Amino acid sequence: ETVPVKLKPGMDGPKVKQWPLTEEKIKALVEICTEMEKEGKISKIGPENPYNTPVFAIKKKDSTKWRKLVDFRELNKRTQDHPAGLKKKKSVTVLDVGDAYFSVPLDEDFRKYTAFTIPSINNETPGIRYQYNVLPQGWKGSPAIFQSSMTKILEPFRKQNPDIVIYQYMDDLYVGSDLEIGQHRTKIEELRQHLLRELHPDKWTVQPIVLPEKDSWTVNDIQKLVGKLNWASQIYPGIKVRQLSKLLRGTKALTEVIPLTEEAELELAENREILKEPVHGVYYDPSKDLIAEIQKQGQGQWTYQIYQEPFKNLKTGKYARMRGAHTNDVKQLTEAVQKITTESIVIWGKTPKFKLPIQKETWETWWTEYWQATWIPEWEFVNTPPLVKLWYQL
Amino acid sequence: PISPIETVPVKLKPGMDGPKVKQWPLTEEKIKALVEICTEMEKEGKISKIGPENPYNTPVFAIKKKDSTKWRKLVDFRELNKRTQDFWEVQLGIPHPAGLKKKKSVTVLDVGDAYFSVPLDEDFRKYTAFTIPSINTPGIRYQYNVLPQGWKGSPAIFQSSMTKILEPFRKQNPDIVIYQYMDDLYVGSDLEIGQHRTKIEELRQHLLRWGLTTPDKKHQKEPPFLWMGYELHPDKWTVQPIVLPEKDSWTVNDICKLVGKLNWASQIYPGIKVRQLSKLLRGTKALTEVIPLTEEAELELAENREILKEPVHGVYYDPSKDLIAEIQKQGQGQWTYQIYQEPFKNLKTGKYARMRGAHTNDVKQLTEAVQKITTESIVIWGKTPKFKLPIQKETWETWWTEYWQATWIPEWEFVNTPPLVKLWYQLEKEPIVGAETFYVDGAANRETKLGKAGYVTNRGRQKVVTLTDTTNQKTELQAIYLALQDSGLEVNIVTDSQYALGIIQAQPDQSESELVNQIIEQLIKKEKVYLAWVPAHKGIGGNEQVDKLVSAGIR
DNA sequence: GTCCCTGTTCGGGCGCCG
DNA sequence: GGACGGCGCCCGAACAGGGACTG
Ligand SMILES: Cc1cn([C@H]2C=C[C@@H](COP(=O)(O)OP(=O)(O)OP(=O)(O)O)O2)c(=O)[nH]c1=O
Ligand SMILES: *P(=O)(O)OC[C@@H]1C=C[C@H](n2cc(C)c(=O)[nH]c2=O)O1
Ligand SMILES: [Mg+2]
Ligand SMILES: [Mg+2]
Ligand SMILES: [Mg+2]
């Protein structure tokens, strides 16, 4: 017996066009969909269903197995409507329990909104269209409708391990503990056996705003410092640029050396102190969206901020790949998006909306070649001002 | 005959009804054509005579077919189309010959009266009512029982029904390739000719079992096969020729035709250009307005005509070999490319000339051409090509280091064919010793649009220019331009405009702004430019002085 | 807020296919 | 002549954001 589900009032289903797929991904989708159709999990449909949702596939690392992935972001937006200890455990493993969802039927009236279309190489055939009959992987409604079965399944493992923290976010279990990694993996295998029916969050650190150290300062150095401190005062009202700025009176050469007064030196040391204190008055709002901004600092370096209101950052961090003899900005950005989203899920249970510093077309040409999660966050494309890149640079 | 496939259920949009539209006068030749067509369709059950219980009607006509010997019945279903439910179209793109592989045996065949062989949902039939006027004799009323031509549901319902019908055959014959473009079937196989022909007969009997005839008239058995507007020879494909208009006065419609034909030609003709001819359509009034060819458009059209006088062909895809894409630059943001596997044997060609953004440079445009080609390659061949680009590795290295955005080009090798793509100037990372320091600024009054732009310099020089009908952003750009004009080969410039800084920092060499173009010319002239930012109205020295100066008349 | 400037989407011509 | 659907190109209209400004 199914659970009747509805769209949010006044919203029609998704009508998102299918984007080009590589030969590999099409062949994997055709095989996967053949098996799913032969098991009743999906049905071929026609064009009289006006809905569509893009579909692709990802081949997990060192794995010969492909995984189908539906981009249910639009449908999840339109579909009707957290353990603090998880972010503290020594180690956290992420299990892909999405297969379970195919055991539960989907409300017959809702199935039409899960339509998707397999393309073909060189448009040999028209697109081939399916809809779901079961709880789809990637749909907001699947973990919800399944939560009771999930809890009934997990009850005894939780009773026998009260120190373990298990958290569900849509297709995944996040299992965290304080065990030696060998005992930890042994317990994880106990769970993966029980379900026949690696992260280390306490090492995530915050990336503070930092000020240059110099024994000689030019007019240019001080101008730069004063602009950076002026920007930072919006995050930290204690920042003051009175005396440093006082040193810049007149109309001076950029390379003129300015000796720092006592007052200016003390102002600088006080600002260095103030940038240590945590940002005051920043409270997570569940009903609002997490916004993640990323900046390319260059040389494999990336900085990011998670906030909900401007300058009220909930977190600031960095992702720092290595030298980069053959470096791929888009790959590294995709990896950074996945890491930041993983952190957001662990800490708050939401995924962030990403302001991505890339051209839309670059991103859409390549990001699915580096994707490895079963979720996809919302995002948007921004032309960052190089000023903020300089502000967060390390 | 009529396919026994199940019908596709269709409804009208909520709270709407069927068309009630008077039949218009047809000529007698088309009345006779329609009468003969309709008496035969009615004998076959494809249309049914309706009575007075049917309140609906929509106009009918007929036109010649490609085979000029035959007529085609059409219905102006625009009103019923408005009132019909939405569909998800299943034709995702157009197949392309450069994506065909070498096959031992090939057949191209066509379905006879394809639409009229697919049944229509019974509940919907009444909305297809029409009327044949007589050469007065009374005129006969009908409705459709099969798919009509002019209805918006027909193409998708037919393409989907064709796919369902071909599925059992495709399953039994995984290694026979059937390109299915609406009702035209290209069929290729790795069989000897006798066994191929036998398989073709099996395919024809399979279709006939499902109600689709394949008239021999449209059964191509010998090369060159006529397919999708191309000629498919055994080892090369050609495009059936392109006749450009040779008119003397040119209207907007004439230019749309010319540009469409050139774009079509650019899939196999290298070097086609449409920049001038296209910008010649900016802000036009209507299709009939007469545009005079600018001398630039004249020259471009002449070059294209010479290009098109040349003989050219494509080759087929060999999946065991790499795809290579070589890009070439022409001016005004125009690029061409060739995709090939063997050195001088194009699979296809293309052009990219889209103008993205108010301000840009040649490295950005090259990156977006690479992106366009990558996704086109994925559609056609399902894989990404290896690139050959007219840009030195160090140029790209410099840009990817400097550029504050994520940017990337796939596997690529430098190609020494000029015009080489280069950055035309580079901002300094540090202030310059010995170069004068200009503090620049601009103010503009939002009411009067009067403004001022100017600089002070650490060596005591000051200048203020007044401007009419201007904006704050424009005065900031003007102040930068002025400092550039009045400085030596090396110069430090301090601005407070993150607008202007954001523009110049991204190193444009083209812009749609005349002022930004003048600035770019100055930047190219300089040996060294260092451009710093400070916050406005914070009293930072130098900036304070110039802000005071340019605010005098304006704030 | 308003004004300015920039980017994106979408509809309307034309090309091509059936 | 003229009806339909697909894809392509190009351009302009109607949006959407973000940065500077006024007293
Ligand atoms: C060329 C064309 C086609 N169509 C629709 C209708 C039939 C299918 C196939 O086209 P067709 O092969 O030329 O017409 P068809 O009805 O099959 O008849 P035949 O002449 O091939 O026997 O696409 C259309 O609606 N408008 C058009 O201009
Ligand atoms: P649809 O049935 O309109 O497909 C076009 C069909 C296939 C080939 C045939 N054809 C024949 C000839 C002689 C020609 O010059 N062009 C052409 O397309 O029409
Ligand atoms: Mg036909
Ligand atoms: Mg045909
Ligand atoms: Mg200013």
SS (H, E, C) A153-182: HHHHHHHHCCCCEEEEECCEEEEEECCCHH
Q: Which residues surround ligand 4, an ion (CB under 5 A)?
A: B 110, 183-184
The whole-angstrom separation of Cα B8 and Cα B492 is 71
Q: Is the same domain home to A271 and A290?
A: no
Q: What number does the ligand 2 atom closest to the CA of B229 have?
A: 18
Write down the domain spans for chain B.
1-90+116-154, 91-115+155-223, 224-317, 318-424, 425-550
Spell out a b/e string for A116-133, using b for 16 or more CB atoms within 10 Å of the CB, else e: bbbbbbbbbbbbbbbbbb
Question: 3-state DSSP: chain B helix, strand, coil percent, rounded to 5?
Answer: 30, 25, 45
Q: Is the same domain home to A315 and A205?
A: no
Q: Is the same domain home to A295 and A268?
A: no
Question: Residue A34 belongs to what H/E stretch?
Answer: helix A23-38
Angle between helices B295-308 and B252-265 (to 10 degrees): 40
**Structural domain tally of chain A?**
4
Given the structure tokens 């995924």, which residue do they identify? A351
Which residue of chain A comes nearest to B188, CA vs CA? A124
- B478 CA to C5 C1' distance (Å): 16
Q: Give strand letter and number of the nucleotide nearest B499 (CA to C1').
A: D19
B493: β partners: B438, B531
Nearest ligand by distance to the CA of B118: 1
Q: Which amino acid is at A148?
A: S
Q: What angle do CA B297, B302, B306 make, to 5 degrees?
A: 150
Could you tell me the two tokens for B470? 């201007």
Among A175, A198, A221, residue at a domain's last position:
A198
Q: What number does the ligand 1 atom closest to the CA of B149 have?
A: 25
- B91 CA to D7 C1' distance (Å): 9
B12 contacts chain A (CB < 8 A): no
Asked if A117 and B88 touch (Cβ cutoff 8 Å), the reply is: yes
Q: Is the same domain home to A5 and A121?
A: yes
Q: Is the same domain home to A347 and A247?
A: no
Q: Is the same domain home to A312 and A270?
A: no
A21 contacts chain B (CB < 8 A): yes
Pairing of strands B490-495, B436-444: parallel
Q: Is the same domain home to A11 and A131?
A: yes
Beta strands in B2-104 (DSSP E): 47-49, 60-64, 71-75
Return the residue whose CA atom lies nearest to atom 10 of ligand 2.
B226
Among A155, A177, A198, residue at a domain's last position:
A198
Nucleic strand C contact set for B 43-102 (CB, < 7 Å)? 66, 94
Could you tell me the two tokens for B13? 């949009």
B341 contacts chain A (CB < 8 A): no
Beta strands in B145-267 (DSSP E): 177-181, 184-189, 225-227, 230-232, 237-239, 250-251
Beta strands in B39-160 (DSSP E): 47-49, 60-64, 71-75, 105-110, 130-132, 140-144
- The closest of A84, A187, A100, A76 to A151, measured between CA atoms, is A100
Asked if B458 and A253 touch (Cβ cutoff 8 Å), the reply is: yes
Alpha helices in B2-132 (DSSP H): 28-43, 78-83, 122-125
B258: β partners: none
Structural domain that includes position A320: 285-391
Which residues of chain B lie closer than 8 angstroms to A13, CB-CB? none
Q: In the PDB record, what is the listed experimental method?
A: X-ray
Q: Is the same domain home to A206 and A191?
A: no
Q: Is B392 exposed, middle or buried (0-12, 13-18, 19+ CB in 10 A)?
A: middle
Return the residue whose CA atom lies nearest to atom 14 of ligand 1.
B113
User: Would the Cβ of B537 be found within 7 angstroms of any atom in strand D?
Assistant: yes
B contact residues 249-288, partner A, Cβ 8 Å cutoff:
none
Among A284, A301, A327, residue at a domain's last position:
A284
| Subunit contact A122:B378, Cβ cutoff 8 A | no
Q: Is the same domain home to A148 and A132?
A: no
Q: Which residues of B are annotated as a binding site for Mg(2+)?
A: 110, 183-184, 441, 476, 496, 547
A contact residues 206-225, partner B, Cβ 8 Å cutoff:
218, 220, 223-224
The whole-angstrom separation of Cα A233 and Cα A216 is 24
Asked if B165 and B5 touch (Cβ cutoff 8 Å), the reply is: yes
Strand order in B184-189's β-sheet?
B105-110, B184-189, B177-181
Q: Is the same domain home to A15 and A116?
A: yes
- The closest of B133, B14, B137, B152 to B76, measured between CA atoms, is B152
Length of chain B equals: 555
Distance from CA of B307 to the nearest CA of A (A): 28
A333 contacts chain B (CB < 8 A): yes
- The 3-state DSSP class for residue A36 equals helix
